[PDB]
Amino acid sequence: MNIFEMLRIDEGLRLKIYKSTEGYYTIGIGHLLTKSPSLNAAKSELDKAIGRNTNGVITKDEAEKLFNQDVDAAVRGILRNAKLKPVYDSLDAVRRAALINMVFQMGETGVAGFTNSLRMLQQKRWDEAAVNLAKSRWYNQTPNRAKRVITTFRTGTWDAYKNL
Numbered sequence: 001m002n003i004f005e006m007l008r009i010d011e012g013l014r015l016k017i018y019k020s021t022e023g024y025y026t027i028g029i030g031h032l033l034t035k036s037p038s039l040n041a042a043k044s045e046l047d048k049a050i051g052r053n054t055n056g057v058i059t060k061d062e063a064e065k066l067f068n069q070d071v072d073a074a075v076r077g078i079l080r081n082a083k084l085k086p087v088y089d090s091l092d093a094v095r096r097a098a099l100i101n102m103v104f105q106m107g108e109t110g111v112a113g114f115t116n117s118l119r120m121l122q123q124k125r126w127d128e129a130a131v132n133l134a135k136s137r138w139y140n141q142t143p144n145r146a147k148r149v150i151t152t153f154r155t156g157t158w159d160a161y162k163n164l
């Protein structure tokens, strides 16, 4: 298992614009287009991202290209973040994949706000961190996905994703 397969399981794959769990226009493998309520605004963002007149439909290769760019940006956002970087550098490979997932879902800024959980992760207090992470809107809004990521941080294995 790897970050790619992991997030592809968490986000799924859709070739037409759709509304995410937060009601924002998205496409492909969780690629957010815009927070605006306007479909046109989303189709515009989409064409600009793809470099062609899409008409709200992309191919599989194009989704995958957006995905590669997004994973990359997530890693780089972590590395450039003074609050995230140290955490990331202290973890093992599996847990690093769990931090990337959160950053991809919620943005570098949202993740840097889990101050207490970040400290526990850094301290390698797995069970405590797992409990702290669960006390969040994140966990209450998307509990199944949050559980998979939390389990990952807790056990350092891919068990929550084996089966999927």
Ligand SMILES: [Cl-]
Binding pocket: 049
């Ligand atoms: Cl883009």
Ligand SMILES: [Cl-]
Binding pocket: 141, 142, 143, 144, 145, 146
């Ligand atoms: Cl969920």
